[PDB]
Each structure stands twice: as C-alpha cells, then as structure tokens.
Amino acid sequence: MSLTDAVAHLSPERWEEANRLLVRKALAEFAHERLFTPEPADGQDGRYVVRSDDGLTSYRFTAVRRALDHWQVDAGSITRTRDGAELPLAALDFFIELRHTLGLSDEILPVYLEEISSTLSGTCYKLTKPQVTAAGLLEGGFQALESGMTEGHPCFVANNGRLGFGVDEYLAYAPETAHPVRLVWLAAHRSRAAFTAGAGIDYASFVRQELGEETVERFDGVLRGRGLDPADYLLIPVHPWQWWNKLSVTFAAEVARQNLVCLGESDDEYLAQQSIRTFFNATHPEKHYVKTALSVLNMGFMRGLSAAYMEATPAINDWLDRLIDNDPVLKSTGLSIIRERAAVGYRHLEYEAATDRYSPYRKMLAALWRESPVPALRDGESLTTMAALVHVDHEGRSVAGELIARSGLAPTAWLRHYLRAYYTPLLHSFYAYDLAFMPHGENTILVLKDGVVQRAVYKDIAEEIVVMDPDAVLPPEVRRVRAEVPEDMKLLSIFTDVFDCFFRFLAAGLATEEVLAEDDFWRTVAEVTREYQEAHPELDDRFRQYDLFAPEFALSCLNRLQLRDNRQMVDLADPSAALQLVGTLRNPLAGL
C-alpha cells in the first residue's frame, strides 16, 4: 500500500550486495562465453583481471577454474580500479564500460540496463526475506522451495527482469514474494475463442471440477443478465497484470462488443511459479496449474502464450504420455510428464490482420491447464523443482548437499539415483526417438523420498519439445514439433542443456561444498551413460554417430543470444540459426 514500504527493500547495503553478486556472475559467465579472457594476474596465482572497453577501468578478482570452462569467481575478491583508485561495484557502470566488448547495441543497452536494474531490485527484495537453510526449505515443502529459490536461470545474467511490472506489481506477482494471486476470469465468445480438450476431458465437467458448480452458475448468471447465452462463451483465466494493463485497453473493442466479458476473480488463491506466468493452486494443490499469457519481458522473450498453438497442445501431451507408458525403458526410469490437459485460445481477427505470424500481438490471450504432481505422491514422497539442487543457502549448504546428507548414501550412489531418474530418459529420448526437451531446473520436478530422487517429472512440453527428424512418423496433431537440425548440432540438446547449462553448476557446487569432487561427478555421469548404452546394442550405430564421449563439443553461448536480441533471443522459425558457437569445450566424459 505505502509509497515508502514498496521500495523499503531498496537500501544501500542490500543494493551493494546485489551488485557484487551480479558482477561476480557477469565475470564468471562472460568469461565462460569467451566474451572476454581474464588475463592471469600481477603476480598472484589464482588472481585475474578484466578491463573495460577503453582499458582504464580494471576488475580484478580471484577465481577457481573447473570443468567445462567454469569460473567460480569469489564475490568478496572483486575490486573495481581506475587511476589506481578503488571505485564502488556498480553493475550498470560495468555494462556501459563493456558495451562494445559485449554485443550491446545503442538500441538494446538502455533496455538491458532496465533488466539489470530490475534483477538487482529482486535480489534486494530476496535479501529482506527471512534466512532459510536448505533443511528449512525442505521442511517448508514444495512451494517453500519454489518461492525460496533465489538465483533463477544460472547462465543468464539478466535473468529476472520481469519488465512491465511496476514496483507494486513486482511485490504482488513475483514468485519469490509468494503473495497469493486471484486470477481474472473472462467469458470469451465462441466466434473468437476455442477450447481444446486432452483425452478424457469434457469442457462442461472440466470447468465444474476446476471452478465449482456454484461459480460456474454465478458466471452463467452474469452472462444471462447481460442478455448473453452462456452456451456461446468459454472461460479464459487471465493474469491480473495482463487484464488491467493490456487486455482492458488493447482489447477494448472485444470487451465493449461483449466478445469478452469480465466475470471477476477466482475464489481459489494461486501462487506464481518460477516461470512467473504459471500458477499453482494454493487453496487446492490437487487442481490444475494455470498457465497464462503475460506480456512481460523476461530473459530473452516476451512471456505471452500463442492462441494458435493451443489447438494442438493437449494432443502433443497425450502422444508423449502414451509414448512413455508404452516404452519399458522410460517406464523403468519412472519418468512422467504432468500433462497440459486443456487449453483455450482467443483469435483477435483485427490484430492478426495487422501483424504477421511471429507478432507478440497474437500471444496476448490464451491459457492452458496442467496436471498437478501432488495427488500422485505416495507415502513419504515430496516434490522439489530441480533448480533446488543448485540453490545454495546462507550457510553455504546446497539443497543437493542436504539431500545427500539426509539420505545416508555415498554421494555417487545418491547422484546415480538422480541421473537415472532425470538424465537417462533424455538419452533414450534422443537415441530412440530423436526427441529433445528444454530440461533445465525450472522445467523439471523431482520426487524425493528418504532424501533420494525416486523419479523425475517433466513439464512445459508442447512449447518446447522437438523431434529432430523431419520425416518422422507421427500423428498429424504432433507433426509440427518436427524440425531439421544440423547433424553436428543434434547432440547439443544433451551437451548444452544438460552438461554445460546445469551439470556444470551442480558439479562445481558439490566440489566447492566438499561433498563430491568433480572427477567423481563426471565419472558417475559416464557410468550412467554407459549403463544405458550397453543395455541397447541395437542402437550402437546411433551411439557412434552421436558420440557422447567425443573429446570436445561446441561451446554454445547463452548470454550472447540475449545480448544480441533481448526481445527475442531465438527465431522460432529457425532456432538453430540464432545459436552462437564460439570454439569448443573439453568434454568431461572423454576418456571415461
């Protein structure tokens, strides 16, 4: 409410800590992407230095170098020097001084600085939260972990901008604040809107289950009072931010003409997940997630949702689900997906006429419902986002460290269970089906029992999967997920997304934490890779064609994508084109 309370989290001490942490990450991850090469130090062994565009400002730091060109920069070691004088660490100055070394055009730079300022504000807010250990997050439970995550995506520096949120909207809607949100419900006329049902879904029963017979009837009452037949309308849940700031103005014609009718708030209370636009039902955890369209800029993309793509989303989930159920190799890993079960899209005829297929004006009003992983739990089982494995608390304990400890297992035995539940299905998906995911910490959930990973749950399916075989035999609703990927890039779905974008941080984390040395981590990864491959000699050709044990693989840079284009990191027509490969990495599996 208060003017002064809304920015109270922005204090000099928290701002200083946020800037140190962000610059540390910038030094580490821009080094990794070879945007700059830290020259060895003036005499000191682990010391390094990086210089501004003009050479006159120097950032000196210490760093432990680790596998996959990992740089763990010590935050407390960083110093900013100019003319022999120390200057305060400032992320904004850093990016301006390096504007040309990084590919930051004159057009992108001020927006990127906003994303940086916004990320730093988020860190300040997170610093005001009660301190919680890895043990406390686990004892807190599923949403305690979800809203307790602090880092966000570990590669991207400008990863938590949420551009579009005012400070009051940040407090209301950001996942790390965990404030309950009531979704806005609209009635959408069937001439413009369409509901697509997964197998076994019926619109009428679906909306009764999810809203309650009482609310459906109240909504039908509001429509009939306006002279509208409820049989002409479909329900669409919308994010409050999207309604107040976008739909009520941009779609004012549709509202005024009663193609859209605002019904009011949901009775249930929802919690934003790490993707921001996707909500978990806190009142009834068994009910579906709701994924909304949110025309906010975060980490390289506007986070709307395509009305057109909703038509085939549940069919792609029904197909993948049956594929897993009918493959004993996947069924034995325990893999499951939480299916996208129903979807609604609104086709704005006029904005479609005025734009092209790639326009964000076509991604402003749509929603899908996704199964909750809670009812499937057995006695003693619990859920965590895979992103928790690389979350480190204020005592230096990662949540993976705490799990290993509580499990009583040797680290490699614990790591083997995790890899069998999470990594093995990726190998089988790749080699037996040309199938790839986007399996980062936010798209993966882990089922825990006795501290041990029992199985993995994948989500965000229809927007993310790809069958890397244009001639692949699929049912028609699914064929749009095929794509031509160059041969020497197909295996990057493992090399980049798993090894260099997640395992790199998990292995380095567990080593610094004195839980598991790097070599023992990557040996376990090799052992699990061989445990799969030796079980299926019929695929030996493909194991040779796509060598996970090759000496090197390509360095596929992630921040460079956002630096080149922070509105749309990859073209969705040709996503392989946007990749920026910059030399090679030594593969840890080689020789193993």
Ligand X SMILES: NCCCCCN(O)C(=O)CCC(=O)NS(=O)(=O)OC[C@H]1O[C@@H](n2cnc3c(N)ncnc32)[C@H](O)[C@@H]1O
Task: Find the binding residues for a copy of itself in span 117-156 (CB under 8 A).
Answer: 117-118, 120-121, 124
Q: Are 289 and 372 in contact (CB under 8 A)?
A: yes
Contact between 538 and a copy of itself by CB under 8 A: the answer reads no
Q: Are 418 and 453 in contact (CB under 8 A)?
A: yes
Query: Dihedral (C-alpha) 443, 449, 452, 458: value to the nearest 10 degrees?
Result: -20
Residue closest to 393 by CA, chosen among 508, 509, 505: 509
Residue closest to 221 by CA, chosen among 230, 212, 208: 230
Query: HSE-up of 452 (CA within 13 Å, CB side)?
Result: 13
Nearer to ligand X, 198 or 441 (CB): 441
Stretch that binds ligand X, among 294-302, 309-317, 334-342, 364-372 (CB under 6 A): 294-302
Minimum CB separation of residue 159 from ligand X in Å reads 5
Contact between 533 and a copy of itself by CB under 8 A: the answer reads no
- Judged by beta carbon distances under 5 to 8 A according to partner kind, the member of ligand X, a copy of itself, Mg ion, none in contact with residue 549 is none
Nearer to Mg ion, 115 or 460 (CB): 460
- Number of other residues whose CB lies within 10 A of the CB of residue 436: 23
Per-residue contact flags (x/-) with Mg ion for residues 262 to 281, judged by CB under 5 A: -------------x------
| 335's tokens | 């893999």
Contact between 438 and ligand X by CB under 6 A: the answer reads yes
- Identify the residue among 58, 133, 250, 412 touching a copy of itself (CB under 8 A): 250
Minimum CB separation of residue 441 from ligand X in Å reads 4
Distance of CA 253 to CAs 192, 231, 264, 300, Å? Answer: 13, 21, 19, 30
Contact between 171 and a copy of itself by CB under 8 A: the answer reads no
Contact between 262 and a copy of itself by CB under 8 A: the answer reads yes
- Judged by beta carbon distances under 5 to 8 A according to partner kind, the member of ligand X, Mg ion, a copy of itself, none in contact with residue 350 is a copy of itself
- Identify the residue among 48, 195, 243, 319 touching a copy of itself (CB under 8 A): 243
Contact between 290 and ligand X by CB under 6 A: the answer reads no
Q: Is the dihedral of CA 354, 358, 364, 366 positive or negative?
A: positive
Q: Are 126 and 177 in contact (CB under 8 A)?
A: no
Task: Find the binding residues for a copy of itself in span 317-356 (CB under 8 A).
Answer: 350-351, 353-356
Q: Which residues contact 497 (CB under 8 A, 6 or more apart)?
A: 436, 437, 438, 439, 440
Minimum CB separation of residue 255 from Mg ion in Å reads 29
Q: Are 307 and 366 in contact (CB under 8 A)?
A: yes
- Identify the residue among 561, 563, 585, 589 touching ligand X (CB under 6 A): 561
Count of positions on this chain that bind a copy of itself (CB under 8 A):
55
Nearer to ligand X, 318 or 460 (CB): 460
Task: Find the binding residues for ligand X in span 176-195 (CB under 6 A).
Answer: none
Nearer to ligand X, 266 or 496 (CB): 496
- Identify the residue among 33, 340, 460, 500 touching Mg ion (CB under 5 A): 460
What value does the CA radius of gyration of the chain take, rounded to a whole number of Å? 24
Count of positions on this chain that bind ligand X (CB under 6 A):
24
- Judged by beta carbon distances under 5 to 8 A according to partner kind, the member of ligand X, a copy of itself, Mg ion, none in contact with residue 165 is a copy of itself
Task: Find the binding residues for ligand X in span 267-286 (CB under 6 A).
Answer: 274-276
Among left, alpha and beta (phi > 0; psi -120 to 50; other), residue 293 is beta
Q: Are 235 and 344 in contact (CB under 8 A)?
A: yes
Task: Find the binding residues for a copy of itself in span 51-90 (CB under 8 A).
Answer: 90
Per-residue contact flags (x/-) with ligand X for residues 477 to 496, judged by CB under 6 A: ----------------x--x
Contact between 302 and a copy of itself by CB under 8 A: the answer reads no
| 75's tokens | 């935050």
Contact between 443 and ligand X by CB under 6 A: the answer reads yes
Residue 412: Cβ-neighbour burial (10 angstroms; 0-12, 13-18, 19+): middle
Contact between 317 and Mg ion by CB under 5 A: the answer reads no
Distance CA 505, CA 437 (A): 19
Q: Where are the beta strands (DSSP E) in 226-311?
A: 233-238, 260-265, 270-272, 278-281, 289-292, 294-298, 301-303
Distance CA 116, CA 107 (A): 15
Contact between 257 and a copy of itself by CB under 8 A: the answer reads yes
Contact between 92 and a copy of itself by CB under 8 A: the answer reads yes
Contact between 308 and a copy of itself by CB under 8 A: the answer reads no
Residue 322: Cβ-neighbour burial (10 angstroms; 0-12, 13-18, 19+): exposed
Nearer to a copy of itself, 32 or 126 (CB): 126
Q: Where are the beta strands (DSSP E) in 27-69?
A: 39-40, 47-51, 57-66
Q: Is the dihedral of CA 452, 388, 153, 511 positive or negative?
A: negative
Distance CA 187, CA 490 (A): 43
Distance CA 407, CA 418 (A): 12
Q: Using the structure block, give the residue that is written with the tokens 């020097």.
A: 81
- Identify the residue among 77, 143, 177, 245 touching a copy of itself (CB under 8 A): 245
Contact between 363 and a copy of itself by CB under 8 A: the answer reads no
Count of positions on this chain that bind Mg ion (CB under 5 A):
3
Contact between 420 and a copy of itself by CB under 8 A: the answer reads no
At residue 370's C-alpha, the angle toward residues 368 and 371, to 5°, is 155
- Identify the residue among 198, 441, 509, 588 touching ligand X (CB under 6 A): 441
Contact between 1 and a copy of itself by CB under 8 A: the answer reads no
Residue closest to 37 by CA, chosen among 63, 7, 9: 63
Q: Applying CB under 6 A, which residues contact ligand X?
A: 152-153, 159, 274-276, 298-299, 301, 387, 438, 440-443, 460, 493, 496-497, 556, 558, 561, 569-570
Binding site for Mg ion (CB under 5 A): 275, 443, 460
Q: Which residues bind a copy of itself (CB under 8 A)?
A: 3-4, 6-7, 10-12, 14-15, 90, 92-93, 96, 99, 106, 109-110, 113-114, 117-118, 120-121, 124, 165-168, 170, 184, 243-246, 248-253, 255-258, 262, 264-265, 350-351, 353-356, 359, 361
